[PDB]
Amino acid sequence: MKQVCVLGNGQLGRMLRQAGEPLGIAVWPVGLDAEPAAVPFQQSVITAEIERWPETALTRQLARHPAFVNRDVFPIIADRLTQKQLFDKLHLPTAPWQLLAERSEWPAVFDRLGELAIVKRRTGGGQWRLRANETEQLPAECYGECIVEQGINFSGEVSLVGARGFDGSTVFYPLTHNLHQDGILRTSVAFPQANAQQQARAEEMLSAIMQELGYVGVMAMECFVTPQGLLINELAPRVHNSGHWTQNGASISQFELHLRAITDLPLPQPVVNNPSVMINLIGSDVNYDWLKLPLVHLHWYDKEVRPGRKVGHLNLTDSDTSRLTATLEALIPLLPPEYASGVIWAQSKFG
């Protein structure tokens, strides 16, 4: 049978466990502080809902564990330097970049990357956007530990969520449009038919990366839409926030898909017929008033509400798009004010 242990105790692991239950797959999400005992590791397929972790009592036991799918891929992707090098190695479009080694480097960096430099920690996410006058602000700790790239002026951001099976087969969801405010995802919208050139471009780059890594399971590739096409921003070797809409807007969710892949169950293409919109709930308390609107699917994480914390998400799907945007309209006043703009941005794509 289907026994799965998930390294990491956050909402992604919870949604995976909720997904496996009606499939008859028992999923055990475990925190890094756990005792290796309470972990049915020795008889499970092992996966993670996190990207990197230190050696802990529990994790040490996971080192070289043969049931840990993709065990060896994580670190390649967890360090932005090696992740960017992978795109370069595959000749995949990505923002121009370099290791930011020393303050010495700034003028050339500016010369070459343009006016705005996006500095990102190599591991553990962690970002600064700087102009030549502002460089002092970057902590001295970053030198040697961050990459820096051209700030991309994209028209929008989209991510491709898909999965690759042990046999190399691949399946994908339509691209999803995502809006980030203060570096965090606030809203996502997916249409059953995306721009065909874009979709094709994304599936070919993601297939190429998954094949290269020998990856099995769900992976998300976030990209920037530019006049020249998509540029790859970053990868997530796991189910990703942008794909949550799949819980109610696809015949197979990203959670079920990930489980199917790693346990070697059937991996047909998920069916997506209507559009969906996802609104992330961040630092807000649950408001059951939202459930007055029948299209609203509430996904509460049962985490403590704190500022800037992802506490849940709302999914809405419908073949009637007038009904859908009307609902979004009705939802606005039921949410705290900082939600409005991302809702309006979502409604705008239905035009």
Ligand X SMILES: Nc1ncnc2c1ncn2[C@@H]1O[C@H](COP(=O)(O)OP(=O)(O)O)[C@@H](O)[C@H]1O
Cα 260 to Cα 55, 221, 247, 266, 337, distances in angstroms? 28, 20, 15, 6, 39
The binder of 145, among Cl ion, ligand PI, a copy of itself, none, by C-beta within 5 to 8 A per type, is none
Residue 316's φ and ψ, nearest 5 degrees, are: -140, 130
Tokens 């996190």 belong to residue:
50
Question: Which residue number, 1 or 196, has a Cβ lying nearer to a copy of itself?
Answer: 1
Judged by CB under 6 A, which of 30, 58, 152, 279 binds ligand X? 152
Total Cβ atoms within 10 A of residue 296: 18
Question: Is residue 340 within a helix (H) or strand (E), and if so which, with residue range?
Answer: helix 340-348
Q: For residue 233, state whether it binds ligand X (rule: CB under 6 A).
A: yes
Kindly tell me which of 153 and 251 has the beta carbon lying closer to a copy of itself. 251
Within positions 231 to 270, which residues make up the interface with Cl ion, using CB under 5 A? 238-239, 258
- CB contact at 8 A, 132 and 110: yes
State the Cα–Cα distance between residues 157 and 53, nearest whole angstrom: 28
Residue 96: name its binding partner from ligand PI, a copy of itself, Cl ion, none (Cβ under 5 to 8 Å by kind). none
Residue 241 touches which of Cl ion, ligand PI, Mg ion, none (Cβ within 5-8 Å per kind): ligand PI
Closest CA to 259 of 206, 217, 215, 211: 217
Q: State which residue, 17 or 258, has the beta carbon closest to Cl ion.
A: 258
Among 15-23, 139-147, 197-205, 234-242, the segment contacting ligand PI (CB under 6 A): 234-242
Q: Of 94, 187, 241, 327, which lies in the binding site for ligand PI, with binding defined by CB under 6 A?
A: 241
CA pair distance 195, 174, nearest whole angstrom: 9
- Closest to ligand X by CB, 152 vs 346, is 152
Range 169-228, binding ligand PI (CB under 6 A): 222
- Stretch binding a copy of itself (CB under 8 A), from 156-164, 215-223, 299-307, 336-344: 299-307
Number of Cβ within 10 Å of residue 129's Cβ equals 12
b/e burial code for range 167-180 (CB count within 10 A of at least 16 → b): eeebbbbbbbbbbe
326 binds a copy of itself (CB under 8 A): no
CB closer to Cl ion out of 122 and 238: 238
Binding mask 75-114 for ligand X (x = CB under 6 A): --------------------x-------------------
Q: What is the largest CA-CA distance in the chain?
A: 60
Asked if 221 interacts with Cl ion (CB under 5 A), we say: no
Shortest spacing between CB 146 and ligand X, in angstroms = 12
Question: For Cl ion, which is the closer residue by CB, 73 or 231?
Answer: 73
Residue 42 binding a copy of itself, by CB under 8 A: no
Residues 110-129 that bind a copy of itself (CB under 8 A): none
Nearest to 264 by CA among 65, 120, 69, 101: 69
At closest approach, how far in Å is the CB of 285 from a copy of itself?
10
Cα 327 to Cα 293: distance, rounded to the nearest angstrom: 7
Preceding residues of all breaks in the chain (C to N beyond 2.5 angstroms)?
125
Q: Write down the least CB distance from residue 183 to ligand PI, Å.
A: 8
Q: 255: which 2 tokens? A: 């959670």
Which residue's CB comes closest to ligand PI? Answer: 241
**How many chain residues interact with Cl ion (CB under 5 A)?**
3
* 304 contacts: CB under 8 Å, gap ≥ 6: none
Residue 189 is encoded by which pair of tokens?
């919208």
Structure tokens at 53: 């972790």
Annotated binding site: 80, 120, 125-127, 149-152, 157, 180, 233-234
**What's the one-letter identity of residue 250?**
A
Task: Please give the residues from 257 up to 296 whose contact with ligand X meets the rule CB under 6 A.
Answer: none
